[PDB]
Design a protein around this nucleic acid. Structure first.
Ligand SMILES: [Mg+2]
Ligand SMILES: [Zn+2]
Ligand SMILES: [Zn+2]
Lengths: 97, 1215, 64
RNA sequence: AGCGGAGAGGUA
DNA sequence: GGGCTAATGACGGCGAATACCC
DNA sequence: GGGTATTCGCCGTGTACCTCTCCTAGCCC
C-alpha cells in the first residue's frame, strides 16, 4: 500500500498506522541512527518535521510542491509542545529559553 | 468542529531560541498559567451533549468545543472576536487554544510531591537531615513533629501537652514539613554545615556532607525556595491532550487520568466540606491521608499502593517506560510518503536502480503528477486532475514515467542493524505488485526472499535529493564501515558459475591449440568446437600502471579464464585472476580492483561480473541428487570395528574393572576418533572420486561432483555440513551440559530412528533459543552503545598532542591472530621510526613490512586535546570511504552500529612449532645446581623470533621453570624447551564494567614483599617500602592467598590469581594498559566467534567511557564532585593564566559504566530519554540547569539541524 | 558523483554548494551546457565555483 | 463522520 | 430487562539503611 | 564509636508489519 495525504491524530499531529485507515509506515528509532551515520541533516530534518509533525509545514511543503517554488520553513513540532505542556502539569517549570 | 479560513494562516510562529531551562514551579506561576479553577468533577454531561460548567471538560476555563462558536448561540459568527457571554463565558477564539492553556485545582490542605520523596536520593531527607521512614510516618499522619526534629507518637504528645500548658506546639502532616521548609535559612545553614564538614572526618559522613553542601549550593544558585517541594495549587492537563473516544452504539471509552482527576476533585470537595462544617480531628486526618494517597497515586501510580484488575497509567507512566512519549512521539514518528511491499529479485536491472510498482509510484508521486498536469495545462483544477488520475487514462502513465527519471527514493528494511540499511536508488516503472531489487544489494541488507518486507521513503525537498544522491547512492556505499573489505561480494548463484567456469581438467576436447586473443576464444566457444575448460595457450594484451604502458605477452590458461579476461578492467593484471575463483579469491580481486583503479570502473565491473556468472550458471545446470551424494566404502567396516571395540569396553566395564565415568570418557573418546576417521574417509572418497586419462595413462584429479563443487567454492556450509550428509554426525549434546553416550551411526541419506532424532532435537531447539536471546541482547547492547557515545564528531583538523600508543601484533603461543599489516593500516603515526604525522596507505605498510619494524608509535583517539569531540588527524583513515575523514562526519554512531551489528550472530609442557631462535624479555634466570638454565620470575615472557623479524609465538615462564636452551639458540619445530611440573554477557561485562565473581587483588604500589601479619577475621598483607610506611589491607579468607615473604614485588604485580577488575587497573597505572586489555579481550572474543572488527571503533567507545574525573584537592571547585576533562582543563588553564601562577590542583581519572556515563552528563534531555526519567528529572528540577544544546539527539528532539554532516555551516554561522 | 570528488575535498561542502546552486535554477537561470543532474554536470565540468555562485546570488539580490 | 487502550495468533 | 448515577512460572545489577561484632 | 555485612528497594529486558475481538457498569423496580 502507499499514501501521501492521510488522517492525523488529536494528541500529536502525526499520521496513523496500518494498512487500514490510511496509516503511514513508522520511521524506526534505528533508522534515524542509520540516517545520522551518513550525516545528511537536510534529509533528516525534512523527514521528521515538515513531513508529518508540523501543522503548518505539512501544508507549506504541499503548497510549494504543487505551485512550484522552493522555500521551506523550519519550526518546532507539535509533539514537543505536547511534551512541554505535559511536563508543565507536573509542577515543574520548563520554558523554551 | 470544522475550520476553513484558518488553514491559510501561514508564518504564525518563529520559535527562535538558544537554550532550554528547567526549574521548580512557584505557586504564583501556576496561578498565572491557569485561567480558572474547577470544583465539580463531571467530564461529560448526560442526556445532552454540552460541556459541564466548571468541570473536567469545561468551556469557561479552557475554551469552546466548536470553532468560532459558543455554547448557547448568542455569538455564532467570526466577526465577534474576544467577546465573552454572560451565562456561559467562552472566549470566541480559535480551536487551537484548547491545547495551550490549562487549569488548576485549589486544595484546602497541602500535599507533597512524590518525585522528591519516593526517589532514592531523597531531597527532603537531605534537607531536613532525616530518614525516609520517619518522614513517611510523619507525612501520612502516624507521628508528630514539634517546632527539635524527632519522631513522636500520640501518647508522648498527650503527656507533653499535659505538662507544657499549651506552650509546646506540634503539627502533624504537610503543615509541619511546610513550616520546617519555610522557617529555615539556608545562608546560615551553609556555614553551619561547613563547620560540620570542618569538624567531622568520617568518610560516609564526609560523603553525606558534600552531598548536602552541593544540594544547598545548587538551591541558592538556582534561587528556588525550599518550600516549593510541597505544593498547594496543583495544575491539570489541557482537555485537548486526552480524547474521549466514542465507541459503536453511542458509548464512551474509559480513560486513566480523568478518573484520577475526578477522584482528586471529589476528595478535595469532601475535605473542604468537612473543614467548613468543623468535623472532629480524626476524620479530618483520615481525609487528609486519603487525599495524600490519591495525589501520590495520581503523580506516580504503582509506586506506593498500586491503586487500580489492571493498573491504569498516570503522568509518570506515559512518559517513562516503553509506551512513553520520548520513544514513541519524539525520536521515531510515523511519516507520510511511505509504503511497504514484498521484495523480489530482478537480474535485468543495474545496481544503481531498483524496481517499483506502478500503483505505488502513482500514489507516492501524486503531488508531482498534479504539478505536472497543472504545468502542461491538460487539467485546470486539482479536482479534475485527481478524477483523471483515478479514472486511469493513458496520459497519466506518461506523466508518471516522465516525472521520475533521475529522482531518487529511499529504501529501508524494517529490521536494521548497521548503517547500510538505508540506501538510495533511482526507481523505474515495472509491472506487478512487488519491488524489484538488485541481487548484490541484498548482501548488505541481509534480506532473504522468503516473504520479507521493506518500507520505502520519498525525499521531496530540494536538498534531500542531493543528500540522497551524493552520499546515499548504492554506487558510493561499496566498503563496509566495519572493515576494509567491500560488500559487493558474489553470492551463492554467481560464485558457483564462476568456480565452474575457472577450473580445468586432465583431457578435454579442443586442447593444445594456440589462440590469437579473447575474440578468437569467444568466436570458437559458441559454435561448440572447443570445450569450456581446456589447457590452451592464448595471447592477451594488458597495460601497466605506475601512467599507461601497454604490453603483449603469452600465457597458458583455460578457456573460461580467457573468457573472463574480457570483462575485467585494464588496471588488473592476469595473475590475480588465473587462480580459481573462490570466495576469498574474488574478495581479494574486488578489493584490488577498488584499491588502485577507482570507483566507476569497479562499479561497472561488478555489474558485468554478475551477468557473466548468471549467463554461465544458466549454461552449467548444476543439480544435486541421490546419486551425487556418495557414501564411503570402508564406513561399514570402521563402524563394525568400533562396535566390536565398544562391546569389548562395555564387557570390561560390566565385568568389574573400570568405573563408569572413565568408561564413558573412553567410549566418547573412541567415538570421536571414529567420527574423525569417518569424516576423513568421506572427504577422501568425495574429493578424489573422479578419475581421467591423459594420453592413455590414467591420472588423478579433483572431482566435479555436485556437493564437492558447492563445498569447495564457498557460499554454502562448511565441512561439517558435508560430514553430516555423507558420514556420521558424531556425538550430540544435552541441554544440561553433558554428552550422550550413544552416537548417530547414520547420515541424512540413510534412514533415522526416533532415538537419534530425539537426540538431535535437543541440539536443534537450543540453537533457536540461543539465537532469539542473542538477538534480544544484541538489540539492547546496540541501543546502549548508541546512547553512550553520540557527541564525538570531527571538529578540527589537528589537536597538537603527540602522545600516541604502542601498536604491537599480539600473539598467544601459536599461530598469529592478526599481523602488523592488518593493525596499523589506516592510522596516523606519532613519531618517526617513515616520517611522522602521515597517513599509512596500502603501499606504505608494504614498504615498512620489509624494514623489520616491531612497534610503531601511532596516535589513537583515546588521547586527544580537542573540545567536544576529536579531530581528523587523530582518528585516522575512514573505513567506509577510502579517502581521509572529512570535517563533520560523526564517528560515534558508526562505531556503535559496527559494534552492535554482529551481536545477533555471536552466542605443564610447551612445545614450539616454528623454526628459528628464542628471545628473552621480562625474565630472570638463576644458575642451577646441575648446570642447566632455570628461570625465576613472577611472570615471564618466552618469545621466539622468525627469519623475517616478527615474533611467531610467545609463552609464559612460571616460578622455577627450567628452560632447555639459551637466548639466540636455533630451535627447530617439534622441540621441547619447557620443563616445569604443577559470550555476549562477556562482551557486556567489559562495557558495563561490573565486578567479577572472584576478583584478582592487585598490589598497592611499587614496594618490596613483606611478611604476613596476624589475622583478626581476615588476612592482612603488608608490603615493605623504601622510605614510606607499609600499605596493608584486608584479604578474603575463603580463597587461596599466595604471598611470598622473602621476595620482591614489581610496580603493580598481582597476588591472587583470577580475572582482574578494570577499576583497579585504572587506579594502578593509567589508561593505556586498560585500553590495550579491553581492545585485546574484545578482539579475542570476536576472533573466537569469527567476525573481524577494527580497533578504532572500540577505542572511541573506551575514550567516551573515560570522561568523568575526580580531584584530590579543592582549589576552586568542590572536593568529591566529578566533572569532565574539558571543563576542568579550561578552568585549570584559566586559574593558571589569569588568577595566579599555579592556582588549581591535579585531577585523577575515574571509570564509570556505560549507563553511569549516559545518565550523569552535562545536559538533561538526552540523559532522560532511555533510562530512569524520574531520577534525572528530579535531579534537574532541584539543580536548575541550562541545556547548552550540543548533541546528536537533543537537536532531533527539539527539531533543528544536527551539528554533524550537512548541517555544520548553519551552526558555524549561528554562533 | 564520481567526477565531483576530485574538484572539492569535502563532500558536505559539495552538497551545500549544489544546494546553493539548486535554488537559482528553480526561479529560472539559463544553464551552462532535472536540475540536480545539470547542477552536478556544471560542478564536474569545472565551471561553477564559490565565487560565481556568490556573483549570481548578489545579482539576484540586487535585481529582486 | 475522523482520532484510544487491552488480549490472542502469524511472517521476517 | 432498564436509565441515569456514580496474583504466587523472572533474573541480574546497583544504591541506601540498620546493625552487629570489634 | 565504627567499618563493612547482609538486606530492601529501584532499574531494565530489540525492531517493524498483518489479522481477529472487546471494552464503565450496575441495580432495585
Ligand atoms: Mg527473511
Ligand atoms: Zn454563551
Ligand atoms: Zn587528536
Amino acid at each position: 500500500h502507499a499514501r501521501s495525504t492521510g488522517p492525523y491524530s488529536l494528541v500529536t499531529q502525526q499520521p496513523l498506522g496500518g494498512k487500514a485507515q490510511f496509516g503511514g509506515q513508522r520511521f524506526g528509532e534505528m533508522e534515524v541512527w542509520a540516517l545520522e551515520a551518513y550525516g545528511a541533516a537536510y534529509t533528516l530534518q525534512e523527514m521528521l518535521t515538515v513531513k508529518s509533525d508540523d501543522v503548518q509545514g505539512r501544508n507549506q511543503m504541499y503548497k510549494n510542491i504543487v505551485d512550484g517554488e522552493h522555500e521551506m520553513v523550519a519550526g518546532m513540532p507539535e509533539s514537543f509542545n505536547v511534551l512541554v505542556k505535559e511536563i508543565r502539569s507536573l509542577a515543574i517549570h520548563m520554558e523554551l529559553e | 468542529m470544522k475550520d476553513l479560513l484558518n488553514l491559510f494562516n501561514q508564518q504564525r510562529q518563529t520559535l527562535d531560541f538558544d537554550a532550554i531551562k528547567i526549574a521548580l514551579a512557584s505557586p504564583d506561576l501556576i496561578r498565572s498559567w491557569s485561567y480558572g479553577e474547577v470544583k465539580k468533577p463531571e467530564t461529560i454531561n448526560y442526556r445532552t451533549f454540552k460541556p459541564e460548567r466548571d468541570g473536567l471538560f469545561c468551556a469557561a476555563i479552557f475554551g469552546p468545543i466548536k470553532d468560532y462558536e459558543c455554547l448557547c448561540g448568542k455569538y455564532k459568527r467570526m466577526k465577534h472576536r474576544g467577546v465573552v457571554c454572560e451565562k456561559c463565558g467562552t472566549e470566541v477564539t480559535l480551536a487551537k487554544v484548547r491545547r495551550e492553556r490549562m487549569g488548576h485545582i485549589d486544595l484546602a490542605s497541602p500535599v507533597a510531591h512524590i518525585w522528591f520523596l519516593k526517589s532514592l536520593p531523597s531531597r527532603i531527607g537531605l534537607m531536613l537531615d532525616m530518614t525516609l521512614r520517619d518522614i513517611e510516618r510523619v507525612l501520612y499522619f502516624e507521628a508528630y513533629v514539634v517546632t527539635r526534629r524527632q519522631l513522636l507518637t500520640e501518647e508522648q504528645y498527650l503527656t507533653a501537652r499535659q505538662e507544657y500548658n499549651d506552650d509546646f506546639d506540634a503539627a502533624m502532616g504537610a503543615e509541619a514539613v511546610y513550616e520546617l521548609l519555610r522557617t529555615i535559612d539556608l545562608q546560615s545553614e551553609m556555614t553551619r554545615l561547613r563547620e560540620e564538614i570542618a569538624s567531622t572526618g568520617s568518610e560516609t559522613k564526609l560523603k553525606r556532607l558534600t552531598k548536602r553542601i552541593k544540594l544547598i549550593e545548587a538551591f541558592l544558585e538556582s534561587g528556588n525556595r525550599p518550600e516549593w517541594m510541597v505544593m498547594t495549587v496543583l495544575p491539570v492537563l489541557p482537555p485537548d491532550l486526552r480524547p474521549l473516544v466514542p465507541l459503536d452504539g453511542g458509548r464512551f471509552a474509559t480513560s486513566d487520568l480523568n478518573d484520577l482527576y475526578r477522584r482528586v476533585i471529589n476528595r478535595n470537595n469532601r475535605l473542604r466540606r468537612l473543614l467548613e462544617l468543623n468535623a472532629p480531628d480524626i476524620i479530618v486526618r483520615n481525609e487528609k491521608r486519603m487525599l495524600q494517597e490519591s495525589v501520590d497515586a495520581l503523580l506516580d501510580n504503582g509506586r506506593r499502593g498500586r491503586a487500580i484488575k489492571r493498573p491504569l497509567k498516570s503522568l509518570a507512566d506515559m512518559i517513562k517506560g516503553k509506551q512513553g512519549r520520548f520513544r514513541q512521539n519524539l525520536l521515531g514518528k510515523r511519516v507520510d510518503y511511505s509504503g511497504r511491499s514484498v521484495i523480489t529479485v530482478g537480474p535485468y536491472l543495474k545496481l544503481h536502480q531498483c524496481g517499483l510498482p506502478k500503483k505505488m509510484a502513482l500514489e507516492l508521486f501524486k503531488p508531482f503528477v498534479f504539478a505536472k498536469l497543472q504545468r502542461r495545462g491538460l487539467a485546470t483544477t486539482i479536482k479534475a486532475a485527481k478524477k483523471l488520475v483515478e479514472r486511469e487514462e493513458a496520459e497519466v502513465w506518461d506523466i508518471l514515467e516522465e516525472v521520475i527519471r533521475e529522482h531518487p527514493v529511499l529504501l529501508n528494511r524494517a529490521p536494521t542493524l548497521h548503517r547500510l540499511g538505508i540506501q538510495a536508488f533511482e526507481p523505474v516503472l515495472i509491472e506487478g505488485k512487488a519491488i524489484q531489487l538488485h541481487p548484490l544489494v541484498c548482501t548488505a541488507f541481509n534480506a532473504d526472499f522468503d516473504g520479507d518486507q521493506m518500507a520505502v521513503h520519498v525525499p521531496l525537498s530540494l536538498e534531500a535529493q542531493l543528500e540522497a544522491r551524493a552520499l546515499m547512492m548504492s554506487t558510493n556505499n561499496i566498503l563496509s564501515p566495519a572493515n576494509g573489505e567491500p560488500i559487493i561480494v558474489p553470492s551463492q548463484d554467481v560464485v558457483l558459475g564462476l568456480y565452474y567456469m575457472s577450473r580445468a581438467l586432465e583431457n578435454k576436447k579442443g586442447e593444445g591449440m594456440v589462440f590469437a586473443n579473447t575474440s578468437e576464444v569467444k568466436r570458437a566457444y559458441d559454435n561448440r568446437v572447443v570445450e569450456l575448460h581446456a589447457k590452451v595457450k592464448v595471447r592477451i594484451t594488458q597495460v601497466d600502471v605506475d601512467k599507461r604502458t601497454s604490453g603483449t605477452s603469452i600465457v597458458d590458461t583455460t578457456v573460461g579464464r580467457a573468457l573472463l579476461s574480457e570483462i575485467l578492467p585494464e588496471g588488473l593484471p592476469f595473475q590475480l585472476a588465473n587462480t580459481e575463483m573462490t570466495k576469498k579469491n574474488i574478495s581479494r580481486l574486488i578489493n584490488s580492483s577498488y584499491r588502485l583503479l577507482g570507483l566507476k570502473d569497479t562499479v561497472v565491473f561488478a555489474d558485468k561480473l554478475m551477468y557473466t556468472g548468471y549467463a554461465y550458471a544458466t549454461r552449467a545446470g548444476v543439480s544435486i541428487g541421490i546419486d551425487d551424494m556418495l557414501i564411503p566404502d570402508e564406513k561399514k567396516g570402521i563402524l563394525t570395528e568400533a562396535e566390536a571395540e565398544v562391546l569389548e569396553i562395555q564387557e570390561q566395564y560390566q565385568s568389574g574393572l573400570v568405573t563408569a565415568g572413565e568408561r564413558y570418557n573412553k567410549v566418547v573418546d573412541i567415538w570421536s576418533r571414529t567420527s574423525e576417521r569417518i569424516a576423513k574417509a568421506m572427504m577422501d572418497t568425495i574429493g578424489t572420486e573422479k578419475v581421467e586419462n591423459a594420453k592413455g595413462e590414467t591420472i588423478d584429479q579433483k572431482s566435479m561432483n555436485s556437493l564437492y563443487i558447492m563445498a569447495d567454492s564457498g557460499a554454502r556450509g562448511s565441512q561439517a555440513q558435508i560430514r553430516q550428509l555423507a558420514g556420521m554426525r558424531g556425538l550430540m549434546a544435552r541441554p544440561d551440559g553433558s554428552i550422550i553416550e550413544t552416537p548417530i551411526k547414520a547420515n541424512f541419506r540413510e534412514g533415522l530412528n526416533v532415538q537419534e532424532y530425539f537426540n538431535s532435537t535437543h541440539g536443534a531447539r537450543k540453537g533457536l533459543a540461543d539465537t532469539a536471546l542473542k538477538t534480544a541482547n544484541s538489540g539492547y547492547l546496540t541501543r546502549r552503545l548508541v546512547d553512550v557515545a553520540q557527541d564525538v564528531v570531527i571538529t578540527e583538523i589537528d589537536c597538537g598532542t603527540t602522545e600516541g600508543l604502542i601498536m604491537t601484533p599480539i600473539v598467544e603461543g601459536g599461530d598469529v591472530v592478526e599481523p602488523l599489516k592488518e593493525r596499523v593500516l589506516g592510522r596516523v603515526v606519532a613519531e618517526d621510526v617513515v616520517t611522522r604525522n602521515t597517513l599509512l596507505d596500502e603501499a606504505w605498510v608494504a614498504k615498512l613490512e620489509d624494514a623489520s619494524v616491531q612497534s610503531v608509535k601511532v596516535r589513537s583517539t583515546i588521547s586527544c586535546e580537542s573540545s567536544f569531540g576529536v579531530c581528523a588527524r587523530c582518528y585516522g583513515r575512514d573505513l567506509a570511504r577510502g579517502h581521509q575523514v572529512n570535517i563533520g562526519e560523526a564517528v560515534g554512531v558508526i562505531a556503535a552500529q559496527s559494534i552492535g551489528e554482529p551481536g545477533t550472530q555471536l552466542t605443564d609442557n610447551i612445545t614450539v612449532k616454528t623454526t628459528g631462535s628464542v628471545k628473552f624479555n621480562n625474565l630472570k634466570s638463576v644458575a642451577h645446581a646441575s648446570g642447566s638454565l632455570v628461570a625465576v620470575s613472577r611472570s615471564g615472557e618466552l618469545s621466539v623470533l622468525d627469519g623475517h623479524g616478527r615474533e611467531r609465538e610467545r609463552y609464559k615462564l612460571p616460578y622455577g621453570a627450567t628452560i632447555t636452551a639459551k637466548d639466540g639458540d636455533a630451535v627447530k619445530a617439534g622441540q621441547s624447551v619447557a620443563n616445569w611440573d604443577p559470550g555476549l554477557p562477556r562482551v557486556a561485562d567489559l562495557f558495563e564494567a561490573r565486578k567479577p565473581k572472584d576478583p584478582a587483588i592487585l598490589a598497592e604500589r611499587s614496594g618490596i614483599i613483606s611478611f604476613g601479619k596476624d589475622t583478626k577475621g581476615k588476612q592482612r598483607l603488608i608490603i615493605k617500602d623504601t622510605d614510606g610506611s607499609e600499605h596493608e589491607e584486608l584479604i578474603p579468607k575463603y580463597r587461596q592467598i599466595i604471598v611470598f615473604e622473602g621476595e620482591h614485588v614489581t610496580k603493580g604485580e598481582t597476588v591472587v590469581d583470577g580475572e582482574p577488575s578494570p577499576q583497579d587497573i585504572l587506579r594502578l597505572l593509567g589508561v593505556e594498559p586498560l585500553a590495550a586489555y579491553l581492545v585485546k579481550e574484545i578482539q579475542d572474543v570476536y576472533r573466537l566467534q569469527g567476525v573481524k572488527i577494527n580497533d578504532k571503533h572500540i577505542e572511541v567507545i573506551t575514550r567516551q567511557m573515560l570522561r568523568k574525573v575526580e580531584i584530590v584537592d579543592q582549589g576552586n571547585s568542590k572536593f568529591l564532585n566529578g566533572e569532565q576533562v574539558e571543563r576542568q582543563r579550561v578552568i585549570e588553564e584559566n586559574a593558571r593564566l589569569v588568577k595566579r601562577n599555579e592556582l588549581p590542583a591535579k585531577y585523577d581519572p575515574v571509570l564509570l559504566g556505560i549507563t553511569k556515563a549516559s545518565l550523569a552528563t552535562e545536559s538533561f534531555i538526552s540523559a532522560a530519554s532511555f533510562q530512569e526519567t524520574t531520577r534525572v528529572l528530579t535531579e534537574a528540577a532541584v539543580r536548575g540547569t541550562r541545556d547548552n544544546l550540543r548533541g546528536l539527539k537533543e537537536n532531533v528532539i527539539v527539531g533543528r539541524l544536527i551539528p554533524a554532516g550537512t548541517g555544520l555551516a548553519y551552526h558555524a554561522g549561528r554562533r | 558523483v564520481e567526477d565531483c570528488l576530485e574538484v572539492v575535498n569535502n563532500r558536505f561542502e559539495l552538497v551545500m554548494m549544489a544546494s546553493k546552486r539548486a535554488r537559482q535554477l528553480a526561479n529560472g537561470v539559463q544553464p551552462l551546457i532535472k536540475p540536480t543532474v545539470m547542477a552536478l554536470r556544471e560542478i564536474a565540468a569545472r565551471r561553477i565555483d564559490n565565487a560565481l555562485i556568490d556573483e549570481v546570488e548578489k545579482a539576484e539580490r540586487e535585481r529582486a
